[PDB]
Amino acid sequence: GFRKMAFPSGKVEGCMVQVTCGTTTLNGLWLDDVVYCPRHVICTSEDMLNPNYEDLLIRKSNHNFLVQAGNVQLRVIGHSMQNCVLKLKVDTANPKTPKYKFVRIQPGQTFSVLACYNGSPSGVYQCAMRPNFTIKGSFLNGSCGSVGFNIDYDCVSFCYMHHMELPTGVHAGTDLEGNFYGPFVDRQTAQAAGTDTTITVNVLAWLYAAVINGDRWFLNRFTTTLNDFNLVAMKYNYEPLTQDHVDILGPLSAQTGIAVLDMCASLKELLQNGMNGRTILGSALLEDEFTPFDVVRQCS
Amino acid sequence: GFRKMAFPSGKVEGCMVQVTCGTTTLNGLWLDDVVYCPRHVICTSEDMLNPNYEDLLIRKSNHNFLVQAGNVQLRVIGHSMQNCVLKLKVDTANPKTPKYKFVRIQPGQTFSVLACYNGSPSGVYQCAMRPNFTIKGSFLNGSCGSVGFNIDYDCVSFCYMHHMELPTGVHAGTDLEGNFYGPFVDRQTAQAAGTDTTITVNVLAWLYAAVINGDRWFLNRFTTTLNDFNLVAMKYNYEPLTQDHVDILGPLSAQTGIAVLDMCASLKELLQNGMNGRTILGSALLEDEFTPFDVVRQCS
C-alpha cells in the first residue's frame, strides 16, 4: 500500500474551456484574459500532413473560434500564436484564475493531468514525463488541450498541454510557452521517440518510501561508488545517477538513516539478481513515477 | 499505457471542513446544513480502548466543536449521532452543496478518495473496496474524515468516509449513514480483516481493456463453464464469478466480440501457467482495481 496521488483538480477544473474551429473541437485553458490551446485546432483533417500554421492562422478571423465556458459562449477579440500554442484574447477575465506560474519540467519530474472531453473535466491522474519526453496516459479521443500541473502551496504551476496521442497511451505535448517536450512537431508524419529509460532517482525515492513503510528485505549490507552504480544502471536501461540527483535524495537518506550510495548498492543487487518472485510495496516491478519530493510530501 | 483515473475533485474540495474537539482535529463533509465526520473526534486518546460514545456525546455541548471552513470559523447549533458518524447541524448552508446521493458500494466497486490533512485537500486517488472491505490507501496522519465518491453525471455520489488506518496503507471506514464496511468497530482493539481475495470480474474487465488497447497474446482458442472457471479461481484466491458479474461484462464482450466465458478460459490459463515473465498493459501483475464500468466509460 502506497498511493500514487494526483493534485486536487478543483482550481484547474475552473480554468477549462471547449475551443472549436470548423468540425474540430478540443480543450483550452483560461488564465486572466487569454484562452491557451493547441494551434492544430485551426487545421482541417486534409491539411495536417504539413500545415503552414501562419498561413492557416492568417485566413482565420477573431470570430472564426467558438470558445465555450460551460453551455455559455465566449467572445474572442484577438488570435495570436506562441510556438505550437494558440493564445486567444477573449471578453471576460477568468474569475477563477488562481495564482499560477508557466513552468517547464525536466524528464523524470511528475505532474497531474486533468483529462477533459470537449471542455468537460473527465478524470485526473499523476504521471512522470518519461526520459524520452513522452507521457504514458490513456488514449482518449477529445483530450487534446488537457493540461498537466503541480499545485505548489497557493500556486497552480501549469507545466504541460497534450498535443498528440497514440493507441499505446503514449502522449506528447508542449509547455504553456508552446514548445514541445522532446523532438516532436504538430504534424502527422512518422515520429520516433527516443529509447524510454527507467528514472533511477525515482526508483531510489520509492525504495526509500518502501523502507519508511517497513519493507527492508531488499536492504543489503554492501555499498557502491556513483561510477560503479552507473556501470550497472546503464546495463539495465537505467538513467545514469548524477551528484545533483544524489543531493535531492539527501532528506530521505537522513529520515531513514540509509546513505544514498547504500540504497544504490541495494538497487544494483535487485537489478543483477531480480526480485526472486518477491514484492516491494506490493509491486512486481520497480516503480519510477515517484520523485524524491513526491515521497517527502507524502511520507511525513 | 492504461491510466487509473480519479474523478475531478472540485465539487468535493468545496464540501471539506476541519472539525476539532479538544486536541483532536480531523476532516468533515458539509452538505446543505449538516457537517458529517467520524464520531471518534469526541474521544480523548485515553478513552479510545472502549469509548461509551453516547456518554461521551452527552458530556459535549453544541459549542464544544470547532468547525473551520478555511481560516473562517463555523457556528455549531446541534450535535447528533447516526451510527459511527457525527452529524453536526451548523449556521450557513454550503453554497457549494452539489447534487448528491449517500450510497453504499459492494466489495470490488471503485471510487475516488479526496485525501485531506486538517481540513485541507491534499491529493486524490482511485481505489477499489477490497472483498474484505478494506482500502489500500496511503497511511497519512490527519486523513480521518476524508471521503470516497463517484461522480455520476451531475451528481457527487458519496460512498465512503475514512475512520481507521494502518502503516500497511490498509484503511477501514463507513458509508455516510455511519455503518462500517466490514466487521470493524471504531475502538482500538485488535481487529482481523477477512482474507483479501482478487476481484475476478475486475481482472476480466482489465483483460477486455488490454484487448481494446491491442494486447491479444493472452487470448487462447479455448473456452470454459462458469463452474469449472470457479474451481480454478478459488485455487488462486480469486472470488467466484457470478451470473450477475458475467452480465455486467456483456457490453465489453460485445465491443471486442470475445464471449465472457472465452475471456474466463484466457484468465484460467494465465492463473495455471503464470505470465511467463511477459507483460499485460505493461503490468507484471493481473490488475483488479478497474470495474467493467471503469473500462466502458474510459474505452469508447
Ligand SMILES: *[C@H](O)[C@H](CC(C)C)NC(=O)[C@H](CC(C)C)NC(=O)[C@H](CC(C)C)NC(=O)OCc1ccccc1
Ligand atoms: C488528441 O491529441 C488528438 C487525437 C486524435 C485521435 C484526434 N490529436 C490530434 O488531432 C493530432 C493532430 C496534430 C498534432 C497532427 N494528431 C495526433 O495526435 C495523431 C493521432 C493519430 C491517432 C491519428 N498522433 C500521431 O499519430 O502521431 C503522428 C504520427 C503520424 C503518422 C505516423 C506516426 C506518427
Ligand SMILES: *[C@H](O)[C@H](CC(C)C)NC(=O)[C@H](CC(C)C)NC(=O)[C@H](CC(C)C)NC(=O)OCc1ccccc1
Ligand atoms: C486516522 O484515521 C487516525 C489515524 C491515527 C494514526 C491518528 N485514526 C484514528 O484516530 C483511529 C481512532 C479510532 C477509530 C480508534 N485509530 C486508528 O485508526 C488506529 C491507528 C493506529 C496507528 C493507532 N488504527 C488501528 O490500529 O486499528 C485498531 C487496532 C488497535 C490495536 C491493534 C490492532 C488494530
Ligand SMILES: [Mg+2]
Ligand atoms: Mg498543435
Ligand SMILES: [Mg+2]
Ligand atoms: Mg469513528
